[PDB]
Design a protein around this ligand. Structure first.
Ligand SMILES: [Mg+2]
Ligand SMILES: [Mg+2]
Ligand SMILES: [Mg+2]
Ligand SMILES: [Mg+2]
Ligand SMILES: [Mg+2]
Ligand SMILES: [Mg+2]
Lengths: 121, 192, 67, 72, 36, 338
RNA sequence: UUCUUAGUUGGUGGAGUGAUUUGUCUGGUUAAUUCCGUUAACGAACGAGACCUUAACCUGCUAACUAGUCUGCUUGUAAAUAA
């Protein structure tokens, strides 16, 4: 019946939330941190929080972590690595039209302007 | 050197020919080779520990089982030792290689599960497991000893001795044990 | 007493049956003179792991359910 | 406490001592030999039989048994 | 009440009541080996 | 061709938990190998090993004396000039002086408050330095009198992981421009260099991650530093506005130790150990992760046990590494192959 | 005693004219309205937990003429020494 009280989970969640960088993959080291890091009344309860918090550490060694936010630490360094383009995948110059599209365009009257249509056999 | 049982009964004097009982018995292990059947072990803890119990420790246990009279292994270890001496003086065989056989024989291979539906008591064909088989075998063997052993000058170490012998033989007329062993299968072979 | 005790071992422990919630259903594999290899789904009672060995006194069986 | 138990301790002391001797008075390697040696045969020579007694309860006559209960 | 210098009620925290002090802020100096 | 092929020599089995510290005897006589090996495990015990001769039975050596001591973990071991005295740091909040020939500790320094993460022994074996979670470095008398404690103005953020003393040039020349010192590395990722009299000499923010270890070249010229930073940084005791050399070893770094001569750096990572060369400008001269002794437990497989300690023998030929499974592995180096 | 089962509420928001409902759920999961997760709900209160006592580990600390071990002495049986 080894399940975790909500409090136990919240703690591990928020601890990891604030100190991710510092937190290790070792329970003992982490337990020490958790104790030096906050107010855990029960010595026992402290472990539970660390034992589980440590668990999450290995589940983030995976990435999919519902409920947790690693902003500056990870989440943001994420944006810094994904914004370098060169030529809009969209060519305003030459554009293509198919049957249907051209059909709608010839009605609109815009049928033919700076965009070329291509036929297919 | 090899630690004989009760000081005079080589364990390697036996082997489990059938594969069924190989893991569901004790003669086979290095740890099992004990001088005394008393280990105050911690079997019966996980859900299969019972296995690792030196077959005779089991016998002694199942033996000190009648209420008031029992609950004291001290003695029971005796009733079992004398019984082994006595079994030897008759077939002069390594009495473990006797008790062992008996254990393999006295265990029913088939039983009927009572499954009743609205008053009617029906039954089905069920194949009896190994652990269950051995358990039944010993329980049975001993069960009988007391039967006659009661208001008799015949002693348990004697009743038991006389039992373990015929129980190995399959002598359906001299083993309250094997009687059921057969009947349980028979009746069971009927309900099936 | 001339019986045809074909020795068979446990392949897979299916589930539990008989609302007596004690009987176990198991898939078997044989090892005996007669046939061998034939797989059956028999009903046990008692302590049983994967790979044990059980003496069937009737290979023509294999009742079954799983609901 | 009891005849049987003492024997178990007298046992456990021997085993622990023979090993304990070899630790500080012999090659730490010789200790390892004997330790596994005993461990392999029986743990009750080095380990400690954890269990003790379990206290009673006003719920009945003993540690886990209780006054009869007529229903009908 | 966490103050040994007060007569309010309690003194020991509630067993669940778990706070997790967020990291503070830090600034400092360095002792580089000058390059001239 | 002439290449580095790492031939294995043997394994030392005896430790229950992690092997957090290792030290080999010093050269009691110019260029003579020392037959003394000391290790420290999380099992709470210190180990004195009986080195074997040309062994390959499977092992390389056997346990000679096991030290019953601390009530907790052993974080580090500092060895006395002559192989006969040693200190150990523990999380139990104490340190111990072992008379290596008698499983006894004649002196325990009690004064630390938090766990201890390192023990520094002074050349002139009379100064004992200890670093721990307290963020304090304590100075002890060869007796046990805690003498001084690194003040606030001086100590650093987070805890201290390791502290060492720059070695000592023997010839009474006018030595280097630097004077012996002792540097400390903290979890705040800061490397500090101390002027003997506990006065700040150099504090540069080293990495971003915590630093698990540091090592000083026998020259007392450069210092190697690494941690979760996953990067190994080496520093010149002179121009320090930047590291004299930087490498990237796969995963986190736990121990860094230069060769007592050879001039390479052995790095203890979670993978295994990667050895680099300052001679070149390469990036991984050698590499071993080979870890799987207990791993052969039919079914039980702890893929790659991370190493917890690195230590060469006197000369610089043999190399030891303590791992997760509490097993020390021996690696020798043969070149000019092919 | 129900029951030590694991339940019980109220603020705002949603549905009903209304008693009332949702919140406290479809599915998993757990000894548990315990979690995962779902989600017209969101935030919360008391309960199980957490906690407290006792039991099991510590050849490492703290100590001990109202515990006990050892060390040098000495005494009795013994030939002494051993015991
Ligand atoms: Mg409302
Ligand atoms: Mg309304
Ligand atoms: Mg809610
Ligand atoms: Mg409801
Ligand atoms: Mg309701
Ligand atoms: Mg549900």
């Amino acid at each position: 019946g080894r399940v975790r009280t909500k409090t136990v989970k919240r703690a591990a969640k928020s601890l990891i939330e604030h100190y991710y960088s510092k937190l290790t993959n070792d329970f003992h080291f982490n337990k020490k941190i958790l104790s030096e890091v906050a107010q855990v009344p029960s010595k026992r309860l402290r472990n539970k929080i660390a034992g589980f918090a440590t668990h999450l550490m290995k589940r983030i060694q995976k990435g999919p972590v519902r409920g947790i936010s690693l902003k500056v630490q990870e989440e943001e360094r994420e944006r810094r690595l994904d914004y370098v383009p060169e030529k809009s995948i969209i060519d305003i110059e030459k554009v293509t039209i198919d049957n249907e599209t051209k059909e709608m365009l010839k009605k609109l009257g815009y049928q033919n302007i700076p965009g070329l249509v291509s036929a297919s056999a | 050197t090899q630690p004989k049982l009760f000081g005079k009964w080589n364990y390697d004097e036996v082997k489990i020919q059938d594969p069924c009982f190989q893991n569901y018995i004790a003669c086979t292990t290095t740890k099992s080779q004990v001088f005394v059947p008393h280990t105050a072990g911690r079997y019966q803890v996980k859900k299969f520990r019972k296995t690792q119990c030196p077959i005779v420790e089991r016998l002694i246990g199942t033996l000190m089982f009648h209420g008031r009279n029992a609950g004291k292994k001290a003695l029971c270890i005796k009733v079992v030792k004398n019984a082994f001496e006595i079994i030897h003086l008759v077939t002069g065989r390594n009495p473990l290689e006797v008790f062992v056989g008996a254990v393999q024989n006295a265990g029913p291979r088939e039983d009927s599960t009572r499954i009743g539906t609205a008053g009617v008591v029906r039954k089905q064909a069920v194949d009896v497991a190994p652990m269950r088989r051995v358990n039944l075998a010993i329980y049975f063997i001993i069960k009988g000893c007391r039967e006659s052993a009661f208001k008799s000058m015949r002693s348990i170490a004697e009743t038991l001795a006389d039992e373990i012998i015929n129980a190995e033989k399959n002598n359906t007329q001299s083993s309250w044990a094997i009687r059921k062993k057969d009947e349980i299968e028979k009746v069971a072979k009927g309900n099936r | 007493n001339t019986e045809e005790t074909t020795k068979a071992r446990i392949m897979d422990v299916l589930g539990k049956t008989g609302s007596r919630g004690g009987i176990t259903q198991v898939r078997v594999v044989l090892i005996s003179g007669k046939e061998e290899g034939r797989q059956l789904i028999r009903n046990v009672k008692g302590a049983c792991r994967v790979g044990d060995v059980l003496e069937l006194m009737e290979c023509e069986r294999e009742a079954r359910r799983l609901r | 406490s009891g005849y049987t138990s003492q024997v178990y301790a007298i046992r456990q002391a021997l085993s622990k001592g023979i090993v304990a001797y070899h630790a500080k008075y012999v090659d730490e390697n010789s200790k390892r030999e004997i330790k596994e040696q005993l461990m392999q045969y029986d743990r009750s020579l080095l380990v400690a039989d954890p269990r003790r007694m379990e206290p009673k309860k006003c719920g009945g006559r003993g540690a886990r048994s209780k006054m009869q209960k007529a229903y009908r | 009440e966490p103050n040994p210098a007060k007569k309010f009620g309690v003194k020991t925290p509630i067993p669940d009541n778990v706070i997790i002090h967020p990291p503070k802020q830090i600034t400092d100096d360095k002792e580089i080996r000058t390059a001239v | 061709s002439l290449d580095i092929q790492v031939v294995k020599r043997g394994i030392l089995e005896g430790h229950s938990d992690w092997v957090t510290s290792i030290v080999a005897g010093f050269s009691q006589k110019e260029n003579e190998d020392s037959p003394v090996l000391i290790s420290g495990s999380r099992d709470k015990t210190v180990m004195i090993w009986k080195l074997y001769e040309e062994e390959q039975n499977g092992y390389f050596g056997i346990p000679h004396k096991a030290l019953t001591g601390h009530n907790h973990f052993v974080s580090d071991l500092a060895l006395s000039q002559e192989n006969c005295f040693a200190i150990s740091s523990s999380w139990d909040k104490t340190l111990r002086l072992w008379d290596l020939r008698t499983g006894t500790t004649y002196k325990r320094f009690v004064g630390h408050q938090s766990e201890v993460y390192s023990v520094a022994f002074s050349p002139d074996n009379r100064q004992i330095l200890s670093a721990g979670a307290e963020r304090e470095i304590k100075l002890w008398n060869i007796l046990g009198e805690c003498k001084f404690s690194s003040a606030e103005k001086e100590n650093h953020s987070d805890w201290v992981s390791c502290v060492r003393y720059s070695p000592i040039m023997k010839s009474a020349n006018k030595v280097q421009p630097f004077a012996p010192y002792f540097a400390s590395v903290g979890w705040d990722g800061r490397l500090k260099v101390w002027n003997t009299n506990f006065q700040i000499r150099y504090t540069f923010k080293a990495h971003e991650s915590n630093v698990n270890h540091l090592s000083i070249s026998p020259n007392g010229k450069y210092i190697a530093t690494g941690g979760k930073d996953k990067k190994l940084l080496i520093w010149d005791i002179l121009n320090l506005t930047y590291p004299q050399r930087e490498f990237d070893a796969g995963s986190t770094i736990n121990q860094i130790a230069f060769n007592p001569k050879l001039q390479w750096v052995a790095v203890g990572t979670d993978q295994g150990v990667k050895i680099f060369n300052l001679m070149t400008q390469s990036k991984a001269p050698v590499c071993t992760i080979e870890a799987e002794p207990i791993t052969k437990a039919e079914g039980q497989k702890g893929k790659n046990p991370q190493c917890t300690s690195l230590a060469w023998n006197a000369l610089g030929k043999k190399l030891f590494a303590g791992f997760t499974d509490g097993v020390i592995r021996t690696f020798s180096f043969e070149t000019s192959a092919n």
